[PDB]
Specification:
Shape of chain B: globular
Protein name (chain I): Pre-mRNA-splicing factor SYF2
Family (chain I): Belongs to the SYF2 family.
Strand content of chain B: 35-45%
Oligomer: part of a larger assembly
Shape of chain H: elongated
Structural class of chain H: mainly alpha
Distance between the termini of chain H: 56 Å
Number of strands of chain B: 26
Number of strands of chain H: 0
Helix content of chain H: over 70%
CATH topology of chain B: Methylamine Dehydrogenase, Chain H
Subunit structure (chain I): Belongs to the NTC complex (or PRP19-associated complex), composed of at least CEF1, CLF1, ISY1, NTC20, SNT309, SYF1, SYF2, and PRP19.
Keywords (chain I): mRNA processing, mRNA splicing, Nucleus, Phosphoprotein, Spliceosome
Chains: A mainly alpha (124), B mainly beta (337), C little secondary structure (38), D mainly alpha (145), E mainly alpha (123), G mainly alpha (97), H mainly alpha (131), I mainly alpha (102)
Bound molecules: zinc ion
CATH class of chain B: Mainly Beta
Largest interface: B-E, 42 and 38 residues
Distance between the termini of chain B: 12 Å
Organism (chain I): Saccharomyces cerevisiae (strain ATCC 204508 / S288c)
Chain lengths: 124, 337, 38, 145, 123, 48, 97, 131, 102
RNA sequence: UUUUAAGAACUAGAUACUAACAC
RNA sequence: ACGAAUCUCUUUGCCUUUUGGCUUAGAUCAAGUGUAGUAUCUGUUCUUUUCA
RNA sequence: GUAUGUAUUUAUUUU
């Protein structure tokens, strides 16, 4: 069950502007590009006539910790790459904040679960 | 704190009655490792054993009704359905084997422990088995489709007893890492720990009314209330250890078996320990083989059932003479904890 | 190198795993409904 | 059948893979959890802490006690805490009657001759002849006393 | 600050509460209660089992058993339509059997709270 | 396809569905190559 | 004969290990002075990372194995980390010279 | 022996693979966790040392000497606050053992800082510990 | 006689490092705050960079002297007793444990 | 500030372990 | 005088690299041959120092 | 008579 239950975390930009939308739910989709575990995939075309189908690349466990739109992979709030946003937030303050992430295999898988969020997220 | 100690010289507890030995039923050739008795008609034991049989004795007469055999390894544990005519008996081959009494035959093998299973109990109102054992996880087996619906996480060690309770926290379980977890199944995890015991917690029991759980230890036997998970009382217990079992009752008598061969009865309210008995071990036994491996009280409250490592069952009777006449026991000298 | 075990495998190490999907034999539905006492 | 074969060629076989007790691998179980269930009790008769080395080595006393009781060794370890020695006597009785009991049952499976396996024969002569001599030495001793 | 330091443990939890009065009462858990815990469990379980059967591959297990998205504010509405398989192709395209170890995550601690001369003679 | 997907290319199904090794087998390549009481049963079935 | 026999307690397997391990160490030493003499030519050839066995195999050097964020806490360390980094960059930055 | 960073590197990787093999087979054998922590200090890398201890605690919290050595591992690098936070989690985790309270004390006496040891003994008395 | 409880022992060691600490302070006479954060729950204490280093150094030298007691104890103990049979090191070790018995 | 191997040459083979190598 | 501290040694305490399973003791326990690779056992004879 | 295990880098990662 609960896999559904934290719901999609989705851009309000890339999602496209139209008033009502249809998107699939496929219970065991791809693995994350990151944590490498299953999740529920949401297809969709942005609008109905579109040529290309948005796919969502990661968990809702994984795109929580970093707080990033699962399709976009920008920040949710600032529309900006990780390696920027936590660079800016490195600047103010002075020196801190990078997220050292996960080579090997079950290093990254493991490290996915714990909920501490991450530096870029820490404030946002 | 002295106030606390003046109060304990007041309440002056609750006269209860002595006990003695009515009946000795031999006839297992192993140790006798578990007992459980009808939820309904009080006619029959059900008696685990270390030769792997299960014999059903007859409460009143003492004769032998039947043999339910059919296990490979010894049976540690028995539980008997209330609502269903079932018998869940579990042994150390890593198997929960349902039974059906109506025909005296096996039905469902529940399955999935990594290793042997030291406790069953039957969730009272939901139709679910709860089991657990040396894996250190407490599984909730759904009854009819044999799915281990929930796997409860948990302790660092073997799980000695699981108690299921109808309302919240619904599973109460204690582990040779010396705690008692209190479980909330639906959320899925521990709702409390009760840590105090200084060694393994080798038995529990549920107040048949007041809704609390006596928690044994090795040498000093506490109680606990649910909801808050209080401490409540501490039954004044010198080190007589080790505690094999807890048996509460309808009269709030309490039993606890020792392995030195000493039955220790308590009042429940107090901690006053008002009788101790050497259990005369046996004919040809070996003095180490005096011990007590199990207990229960029948549904009337008046009669005691225990097995003993010397290969026999004993049934103790509540001796009515009592009153005060010269009844009294150890006469209430609460001391320095 | 024969060592007496001192332990057992915590159910947890199992518990984290993802499932399988293999279907065994003895799980085929049987005794599909219970019985109650008066 | 093949439904499995294909989900195994995709999803990889089952990772846990418990097993069960069975015909052959019985003993290692029965033993295994016997000794575990000494090591509770002997772990809880000690007053406080000292455990690991003291424990394991006391188990070595366990085994040594058993294979004494085979060879009939009267097994007095010169000095040693009395209660622990009680435990050893207790269990070795328990396992003992596991042994004698199994020796009867099987011998009277052979007597009917219904499919007792191969090694089970050779073993069973073992358990027997041991038992025969124990009976012997007894019978002589009490012929002394 | 004496609260800042040791902050967790406190003495009211070592103090047995039936020493003051015997006869202190905790009520057996009624009737109009047990039919609640019974409810929330029983429903929740039936959703568990309903799941685990409808995972797997018995074509015959099925017999034995939402708009849901306001995203952002709902801003773009939604409707969530599952995709009918192609029944031969794998179901759960990404399911697999792997192995993890997991972070045991907590903030807080469980104070272990209890109470060598003549004894090591004995033992 | 099942076979070549187990990485056995040295077993050959002829058109009557005999299974013959075309390259005398290195022992490891036997062990990896025992096939199933199913897949054999079903080979035969098709043969009929 | 006997006086020689008593003095080896292990059995064929353990001895076999003693050998295998030493042979590994000769491999190391060799491969090293390979790299050393290549440094005396100045051409710097990187060392291999010895492959994998099971597909998920861990390379421990690369990332913190299982990283437990030590705790929360009231005492606000937050300065000592800079003394750390100063000492660690200091140490590794030394060794390179 | 060692030449540059890269040789030290392989000398680390080899050790870590080996040891954490030997911890991978025995979760117990605490002395192994200790020794491996000690190596991890001699590499002047603390962060890994902190973790390795933390895990070593999640195995068993009732073995004190690992608490102690996970104090002294923080002090011998002359970093205190960690050796404080560790002590809050320590005495709170094990009030009934003395050596924690005494050691946290001495840590506050060699710092001369009294306000602590006052409030400290205020607690460690307030629990009715003993004489 | 004898064995000391792990309690009284920890107290006694507390006394020994008491008096040692006292030779630190007093001998330093012979040879011659707490801030809290309203922003976050963190607390901030100010200490001399002095006496922290005496602390650490003291610890190190303790580890030293103990380490050396153990080492010299290796040397002497393994050189002395010449009686029982020894196949290898661990026969001497363990066997001297069996001598420790009676 | 540490250190010091008796040194060199000549000699036959007995007991040995084993060998997908020869009835 | 004794209080305090460093080093050294003896004694006691604590054991520091200090036996990690089961089944029929798990079962079994000698008669060969030629050559060949490799380990090692003994004799004899001679000579007792330094600097660029 | 054998299982089993090990290495098999060719195509120049910035001073
Ligand atoms: Zn997006
Ligand atoms: Zn993910």
């Amino acid at each position: 069950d609960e896999i559904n239950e934290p719901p999609p975390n989705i851009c309000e930009q890339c999602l496209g502007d139209e008033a009502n939308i249809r998107m699939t739910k496929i219970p065991q989709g791809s693995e994350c590009k990151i944590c490498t575990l299953p999740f529920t995939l949401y297809h969709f075309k942005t609008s109905k006539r579109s040529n290309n189908i948005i796919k969502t690349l990661i968990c809702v466990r994984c795109a929580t910790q970093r707080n990033i739109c699962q399709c976009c992979m920008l920040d949710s709030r600032w529309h900006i790459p990780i390696q920027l946003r936590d660079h800016l937030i490195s600047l103010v303050n002075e020196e801190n904040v990078m997220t050292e992430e996960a080579k090997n295999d079950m290093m990254k898988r493991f490290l996915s679960l714990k909920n501490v969020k991450l530096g870029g997220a820490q404030i946002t | 704190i002295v106030n606390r100690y003046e109060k304990l010289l007041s309440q002056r507890p609750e006269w209860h009655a002595p006990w003695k030995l009515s009946r000795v039923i031999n006839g297992h050739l192993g140790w006798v490792r578990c007992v459980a008795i009808d939820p309904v008609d009080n006619e029959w034991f059900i008696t685990g054993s270390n030769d792997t049989t299960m014999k059903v004795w007859d409460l009143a007469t003492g004769k032998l009704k039947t043999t339910l055999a059919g296990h490979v390894m010894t049976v540690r544990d028995v539980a008997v359905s209330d609502r269903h005519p079932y018998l869940f008996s579990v042994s150390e081959d890593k198997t929960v084997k349902c039974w059906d009494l109506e025909k005296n035959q096996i039905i469902r093998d529940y399955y999935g422990h990594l290793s042997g299973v030291r406790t069953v109990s039957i969730h009272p109102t939901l139709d679910l088995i709860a089991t657990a054992g040396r894996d250190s996880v407490i599984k909730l087996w759904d009854m009819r489709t044999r799915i281990p619906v929930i796997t409860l996480v948990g302790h660092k060690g073997p799980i000695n007893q699981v108690q299921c309770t109808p309302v919240d926290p619904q599973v109460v379980s204690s582990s040779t890492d010396a705690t008692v977890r209190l479980w909330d199944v639906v959320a899925g995890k521990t709702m409390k720990v009760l840590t105090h015991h200084k060694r393994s917690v080798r038995a529990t029991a549920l107040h048949p009314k007041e809704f609390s759980v006596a928690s044994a230890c090795t040498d000093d036997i506490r109680s606990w209330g649910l909801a808050e998970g209080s401490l409540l009382t501490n039954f004044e217990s010198e080190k007589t250890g080790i505690i094999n079992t807890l048996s509460i009752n309808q009269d709030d008598v309490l039993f606890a078996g020792g392995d030195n061969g000493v039955l220790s009865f308590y009042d429940y309210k107090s901690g006053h320990k008002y009788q101790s008995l050497a259990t005369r071990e046996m004919v040809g036994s070996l003095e180490g083989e005096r011990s007590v491996l199990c207990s229960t009280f029948d549904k009337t409250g008046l009669r005691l059932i225990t097995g003993e490592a010397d290969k026999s069952i004993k049934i103790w009777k509540q001796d009515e003479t009592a009153t005060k006449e010269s009844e009294p026991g150890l006469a209430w000298n609460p001391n320095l904890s | 190198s024969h060592r007496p075990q001192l332990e057992a495998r915590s159910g947890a190490k199992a518990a984290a795993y993802t499932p399988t999907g293999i279907e065994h034999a003895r799980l085929l539905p049987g005794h599909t409904t219970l019985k109650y006492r008066k | 059948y093949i439904g499995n074969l294909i989900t195994r060629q995709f999803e990889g076989r089952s990772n846990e893979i418990v097993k069960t007790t069975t015909k052959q691998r019985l003993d290692a179980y029965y033993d295994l959890e016997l000794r575990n269930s000494v090591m509770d009790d002997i772990l809880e008769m000690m007053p406080e802490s000292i455990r690991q080395k003291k424990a394991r080595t006391i188990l070595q006393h366990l085994s040594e006690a058993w294979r004494c009781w085979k060879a009939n060794i009267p097994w007095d370890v010169p000095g040693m805490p009395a209660p622990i020695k009680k435990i050893i006597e207790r269990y070795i009785k328990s396992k003992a009657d596991a042994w004698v009991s199994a020796a009867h049952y099987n011998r009277e499976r052979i007597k009917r001759g219904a499919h007792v396996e191969k090694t089970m024969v050779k073993k069973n002569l073992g358990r027997l002849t041991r038992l025969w001599i124990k009976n012997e030495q007894e019978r002589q001793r009490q012929i002394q006393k | 600050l004496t609260d800042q330091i040791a902050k967790n443990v406190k003495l009211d939890d070592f103090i047995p509460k039936r020493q003051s009065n015997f006869e202190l009462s905790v009520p057996l858990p009624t009737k109009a209660e047990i039919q609640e815990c019974t409810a929330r469990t029983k429903s929740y379980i039936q959703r568990l089992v309903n799941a685990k059967l409808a995972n797997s591959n018995n074509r015959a297990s099925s017999r034995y058993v939402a708009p849901a998205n306001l995203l952002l504010n709902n801003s773009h509405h939604i409707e969530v339509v599952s995709k009918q398989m192609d029944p031969l192709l794998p179901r759960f395209v990404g399911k697999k059997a792997r192995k993890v170890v997991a972070p045991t995550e907590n903030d807080e601690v469980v104070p272990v709270l209890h109470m060598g001369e003549a004894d090591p003679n004995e033992w | 396809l099942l076979i070549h997907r187990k990485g056995l290319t040295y077993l050959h199904l002829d058109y009557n569905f005999n299974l013959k090794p075309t390259k005398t087998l290195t022992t490891k390549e036997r062990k990896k190559s025992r096939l199933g009481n199913s897949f054999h049963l079903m080979r035969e079935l098709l043969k009929m | 004969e006997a006086r020689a026999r008593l003095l080896n307690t292990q059995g064929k397997k353990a001895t076999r290990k003693i050998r295998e391990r030493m042979l590994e160490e000769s491999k190391r030493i060799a491969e090293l002075q390979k790299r050393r003499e290549l440094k005396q030519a100045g051409i710097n050839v990187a060392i291999k990372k010895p492959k994998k066995k099971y597909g998920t195999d861990i390379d421990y050097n690369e990332d913190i194995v299982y990283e437990q964020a030590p705790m929360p806490g009231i005492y606000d360390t937050s300065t000592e980390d800079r003394q750390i980094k100063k000492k660690f960059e200091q140490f590794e930055r030394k060794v390179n010279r | 022996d060692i030449l540059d960073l890269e040789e030290l590197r392989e000398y680390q990787r080899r050790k870590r693979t080996e040891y954490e093999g030997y911890l991978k087979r025995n979760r117990l054998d605490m002395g192994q966790w200790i020794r491996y922590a000690q190596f991890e200090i001699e590499q002047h890398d603390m962060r890994r040392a902190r973790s390795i201890f933390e895990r070593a605690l999640l195995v068993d919290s009732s073995f004190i000497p690992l608490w102690i050595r996970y104090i002294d591992a923080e002090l011998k690098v002359k970093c205190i606050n960690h050796a404080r936070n560790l002590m809050n989690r320590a005495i709170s985790t094990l009030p009934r053992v003395d050596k924690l309270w005494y050691k946290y004390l001495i840590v506050e006496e060699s710092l001369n800082n009294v306000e602590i040891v006052r409030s400290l003994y205020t607690k460690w008395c307030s629990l009715e510990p003993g004489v | 006689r004898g064995g000391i409880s792990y309690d009284q022992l920890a107290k006694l060691s507390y006394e020994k490092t008491l008096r040692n600490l006292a030779t630190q302070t007093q001998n330093s006479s012979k040879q011659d705050k707490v801030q809290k954060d309203t922003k976050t729950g963190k607390i901030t204490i100010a200490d001399d960079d002095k006496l922290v280093n005496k602390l650490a150094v003291s610890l190190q030298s303790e580890s030293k002297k103990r380490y050396e007691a153990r080492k010299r104890q290796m040397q002497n103990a393994k050189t002395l007793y010449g009686v029982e049979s020894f196949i290898n090191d661990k026969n001497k070790q363990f066997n001297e444990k069996l001598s420790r018995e009676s």
